[PDB]
Amino acid sequence: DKISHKIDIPDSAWTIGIGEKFKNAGHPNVKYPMIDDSYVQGAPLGGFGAGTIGRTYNGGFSRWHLEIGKNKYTTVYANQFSVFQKVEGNKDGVAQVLYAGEPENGYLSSWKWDYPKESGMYYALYPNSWYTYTNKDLPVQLAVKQFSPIIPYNYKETSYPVAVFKWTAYNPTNKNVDVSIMFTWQNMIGFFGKQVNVNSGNFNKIIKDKSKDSEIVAAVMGNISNDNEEWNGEYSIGVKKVPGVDISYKAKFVTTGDGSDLWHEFSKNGILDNKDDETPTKQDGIGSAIAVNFKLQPGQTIEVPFALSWDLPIMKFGGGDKWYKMYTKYFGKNGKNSFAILKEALNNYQKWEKMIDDWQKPILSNKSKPDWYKTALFNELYYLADGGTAWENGKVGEKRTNNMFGLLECFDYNYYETLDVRFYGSFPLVMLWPDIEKQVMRQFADTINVQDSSEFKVGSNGAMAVKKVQGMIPHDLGSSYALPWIKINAYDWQNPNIWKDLNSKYVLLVYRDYVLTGKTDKEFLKYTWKSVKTALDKLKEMDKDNDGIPDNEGIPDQTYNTWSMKGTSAYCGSLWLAALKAAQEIGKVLKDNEAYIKYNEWYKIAQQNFEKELWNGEYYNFDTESDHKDSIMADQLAGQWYADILRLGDILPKDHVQKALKKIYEFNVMKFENGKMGAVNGMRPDGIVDESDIQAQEVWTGVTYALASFMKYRGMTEEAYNTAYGVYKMTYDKSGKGYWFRTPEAWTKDGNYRASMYMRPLSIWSMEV
Numbered sequence: 001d002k003i004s005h006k007i008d009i010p011d012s013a014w015t016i017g018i019g020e021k022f023k024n025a026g027h028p029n030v031k032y033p034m035i036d037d038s039y040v041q042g043a044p045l046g047g048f049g050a051g052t053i054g055r056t057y058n059g060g061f062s063r064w065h066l067e068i069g070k071n072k073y074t075t076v077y078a079n080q081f082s083v084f085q086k087v088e089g090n091k092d093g094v095a096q097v098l099y100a101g102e103p104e105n106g107y108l109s110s111w112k113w114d115y116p117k118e119s120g121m122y123y124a125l126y127p128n129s130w131y132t133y134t135n136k137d138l139p140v141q142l143a144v145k146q147f148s149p150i151i152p153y154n155y156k157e158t159s160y161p162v163a164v165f166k167w168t169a170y171n172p173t174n175k176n177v178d179v180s181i182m183f184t185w186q187n188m189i190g191f192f193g194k195q196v197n198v199n200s201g202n203f204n205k206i207i208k209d210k211s212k213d214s215e216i217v218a219a220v221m222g223n224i225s226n227d228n229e230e231w232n233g234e235y236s237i238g239v240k241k242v243p244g245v246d247i248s249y250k251a252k253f254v255t256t257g258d259g260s261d262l263w264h265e266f267s268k269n270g271i272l273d274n275k276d277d278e279t280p281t282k283q284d285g286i287g288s289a290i291a292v293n294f295k296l297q298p299g300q301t302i303e304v305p306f307a308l309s310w311d312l313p314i315m316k317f318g319g320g321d322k323w324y325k326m327y328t329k330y331f332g333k334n335g336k337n338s339f340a341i342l343k344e345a346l347n348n349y350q351k352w353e354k355m356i357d358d359w360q361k362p363i364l365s366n367k368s369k370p371d372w373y374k375t376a377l378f379n380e381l382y383y384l385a386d387g388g389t390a391w392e393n394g395k396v397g398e399k400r401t402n403n404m405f406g407l408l409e410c411f412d413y414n415y416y417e418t419l420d421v422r423f424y425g426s427f428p429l430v431m432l433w434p435d436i437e438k439q440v441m442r443q444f445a446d447t448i449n450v451q452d453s454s455e456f457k458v459g460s461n462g463a464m465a466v467k468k469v470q471g472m473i474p475h476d477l478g479s480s481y482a483l484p485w486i487k488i489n490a491y492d493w494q495n496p497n498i499w500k501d502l503n504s505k506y507v508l509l510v511y512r513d514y515v516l517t518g519k520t521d522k523e524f525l526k527y528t529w530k531s532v533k534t535a536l537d538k539l540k541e542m543d544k545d546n547d548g549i550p551d552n553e554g555i556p557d558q559t560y561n562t563w564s565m566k567g568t569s570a571y572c573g574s575l576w577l578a579a580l581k582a583a584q585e586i587g588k589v590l591k592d593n594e595a596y597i598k599y600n601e602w603y604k605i606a607q608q609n610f611e612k613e614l615w616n617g618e619y620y621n622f623d624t625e626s627d628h629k630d631s632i633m634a635d636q637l638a639g640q641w642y643a644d645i646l647r648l649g650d651i652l653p654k655d656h657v658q659k660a661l662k663k664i665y666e667f668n669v670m671k672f673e674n675g676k677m678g679a680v681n682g683m684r685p686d687g688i689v690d691e692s693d694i695q696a697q698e699v700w701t702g703v704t705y706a707l708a709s710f711m712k713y714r715g716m717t718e719e720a721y722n723t724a725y726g727v728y729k730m731t732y733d734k735s736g737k738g739y740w741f742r743t744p745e746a747w748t749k750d751g752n753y754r755a756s757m758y759m760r761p762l763s764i765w766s767m768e769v
């Protein structure tokens with residue numbers, strides 16, 4: 001490996017061998033069907049709301065999130081980079097697809113598949129990833145840096161449906177070597193969204209954009225239809241000329257054939273036919289190819305950028321609504337703009353690399369933080385793009401001021417912005433894209449007094465329940481299978497209108513968003529204030545026994561949606577106390593004296609009673625009325641955690657909080673698989689895991705990272721990082737269970753999982769507060 005020195009990969013990048021088999025992978029631990037796409041994954045490409053494409057560490061374009069809200073795992077084998085090399089003085093060169101695998105059927109059988117093991121590495125530090133190719137049969141060593149321009153405090157380039165592939169080639173040998181790099185792409189119009197005739201009308205064209213000191217050559221893969229539908233638009237691939245390279249292309253090869261129409265050209269001398277052909281296809285799949293060829297002298301390096309764009313302007317949801325995607329603000333809505341997007345990337349990628357470096361540098365340069373922590377911190381952000389992210393720029397046929405936004409809970413539980421989960425998972429948005437965060441919270445504010453008296457069948461028990469109660473915050477803002485933003489509470493497994501945590505978490509999120517954006521946005525507090533007061537006032541009515549605290553009802557009525565709480569719980573009770581304190585402070589800011597006094601009165605009574613009911617001398621009891629009320633809950637002081645972040649001070653005595661956190665570390669972490677897998681949710685005082693429910697026996701990744709941040713703020717630095725380390729290890733390490741780029745909600749002691757690709761572990765960003 002002599003190519004690594006010619007590029008700059010951070011030491012904190014996650015690494016794996018190209019073609020590496022992983023032996024220890026986990027699988028779902030639930031009885032019913034659950035997504036398991038395997039460990040062959042990688043960092044995604046594509047902006048927020050753009051649809052994303054997961055290119056895996058083996059080189060394949062395999063995890064397709066282009067249909068917004070859906071996860072489709074299938075390798076489109078025509079989509080590849082390939083290499084040709086010939087040493088000066090040899091009769092023949094060698095050609096190789098850079099993919100550690102082969103197609104399942106006979107399509108593309110002429111191509112040289114099965115990139116060998118132990119011949120290259122994949123690296124990832126989201127939004128960047130890299131491949132290096134160090135192969136005994138390839139005298140010139142190659143590397144690529146691939147990324148999309150995901151940039152904090154930037155709402156423009158961050159939306160773009162584009163990826164850059166910056167290639168570096170170096171000749172460490174004593175002979176001249178001819179080299180070619182070829183990007184192939186299938187015309188994927190009709191891959192989704194088209195009910196019949198899936199390839200019909202697809203056609204490919206070549207664009208040559210020549211100006212002074214700029215030559216771009218690109219293929220635009222589209223359809224003859226000018227119809228404005230979810231399925232129609234364009235893909236583009238292309239390259240920018242640099243000194244010392246020549247460009248060749250092939251506009252049309254058949255992907256539903258043996259591929260030799262292309263490969264006989266590339267494998268001879270690495271130079272394509274430059275054959276244009278705009279003939280539309282009928283049944284055959286078609287694709288395009290863009291190649292560069294160059295001679296490297298001994299010791300010579302060359303850099304060449306390729307790009308990929310996709311202009312699919314319309315997203316459709318299962319309920320029928322069609323919306324324009326955010327990037328259409330910048331490029332247009334007609335779906336004929338893929339070249340413009342590609343050109344912007346090829347002309348500006350060096351600026352974008354610097355912008356990414358600028359935001360990563362403050363963390364990467366901090367030598368007090370271990371590299372493993374940086375691996376997790378950056379790579380967990382994959383989910384912001386990969387979480388079915390929807391970001392609208394108008395309803396088709398509709399202009400408003402704002403652009404509504406949603407991130408999925410996950411794909412198994414297909415709900416937008418699940419509030420009990422975003423309480424943990426929304427940290428990156430408030431910290432790095434706060435204008436999105438505030439928009440999402442205003443979306444929630446607008447739902448507070450919505451009433452839908454129509455009744456739905458509750459999945460868990462078969463009871464009938466009212467859809468949406470006035471004054472209760474919704475569980476979610478809809479499902480991609482139905483109508484995001486329009487039809488809230490798509491979740492029907494239980495009735496969220498009786499949950500005891502949603503209204504408090506809502507208030508805490510509002511005050512968080514004010515505090516973490518500088519305590520300057522009084523307009524945001526003004527917009528949300530009525531909903532905050534309504535939310536707390538409705539929750540107060542659920543206090544049955546008049547201790548000042550809402551009562552959990554002994555049926556799941558909070559985020560731990562099978563682990564029943566009854567009476568006053570540490571979890572909902574502490575969240576309530578913190579929400580009351582937050583509302584007091586908002587009252588002071590907005591000069592609402594009567595609100596300040598009322599919430600101060602409620603707070604003093606509830607605080608007193610919480611302490612009396614739950615403090616046992618070592619920790620806070622799980623609740624007052626359950627069978628295992630003395631269980632040690634990892635999340636017992638969630639309200640105090642948020643109070644620390646919101647700078648609301650002590651809601652509980654410092655000594656008692658410190659004792660509780662120490663107990664949690666000693667028990668839920670260190671007595672669970674030697675503290676190497678995170679914090680188990682529930683532990684009995686005798687040091688054995690609480691078996692009352694499956695959720696008590698699970699580690700929740702997002703709960704554990706949040707707990708780590710709580711410990712960190714309280715000065716328990718070693719405990720904080722040790723606690724988080726088990727989550728990193730299970731996710732990313734060779735000794736873990738292979739969950740990179742699909743961090744799950746939970747695992748059990750055997751390491752098997754529930755709900756891969758989950759929003760909650762974005763809570764790791766709470767460690768950067």
Ligand SMILES: OC[C@H]1O[C@@H](O[C@H]2[C@H](O)[C@@H](O)[C@H](O)O[C@@H]2CO)[C@H](O)[C@@H](O)[C@@H]1O
Binds near residue numbers: 409418420421491561
């Ligand atoms: O993991 C807790 C999380 O569960 C979500 O509900 C799931 C539930 O975990 C699963 O057992 C059931 O089969 O499906 C539902 C989704 O319909 C829930 O959406 C979250 O609020 C909760 O935090």
Ligand SMILES: [Ca+2]
Binds near residue numbers: 548
């Ligand atoms: Ca009560």
